[PDB]
């Protein structure tokens, strides 16, 4: 079965930069496609970004697109979710999720399969 984690919250200063984990099961990575979600104080959970696991390419959601990038390890367990030149706004709980390629829009939550339980990260002044 496929089991996605989270990890590399915590608490980070504005404008400064930190790397998400996802790890997954297998060859979970190797089969299903990535995305990107989180969660704000309040508000709905919303995309972030999009990593198509058949050539590699990235796709961002405006929020921050040019701050924050995606990859994947050598041994493709997991996907990793760079940020750079935090702001106090990008406080939210992150979650990665997975689907099956070629299954609707990869912007939509309701096209993916499984889920992680997120991770916390708290940007302050």
């Known amino acids: 079965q496929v089991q996605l984690q989270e990890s590399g919250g915590g608490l980070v200063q504005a404008g400064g930069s930190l790397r998400l984990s996802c790890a997954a099961s297998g060859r979970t990575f190797s089969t299903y496609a990535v995305g990107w979600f989180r969660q704000a104080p309040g508000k709905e959970r919303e995309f972030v970004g999009y990593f198509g696991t058949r050539g590699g390419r990235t796709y961002y959601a405006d929020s921050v697109k040019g701050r924050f990038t995606i990859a994947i390890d050598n041994a493709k367990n997991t996907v990793y979710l760079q940020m750079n030149s935090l702001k106090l706004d990008d406080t939210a709980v992150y979650y990665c999720?997975?689907?099956?390629?070629?299954?609707?829009?990869?912007?939509?939550?309701?096209?993916?399969?499984?889920w992680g339980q997120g991770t916390q990260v708290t940007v302050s002044s």
């Open positions: 999720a997975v689907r099956m390629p070629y299954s609707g829009d990869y912007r939509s939550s309701g096209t993916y399969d499984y």
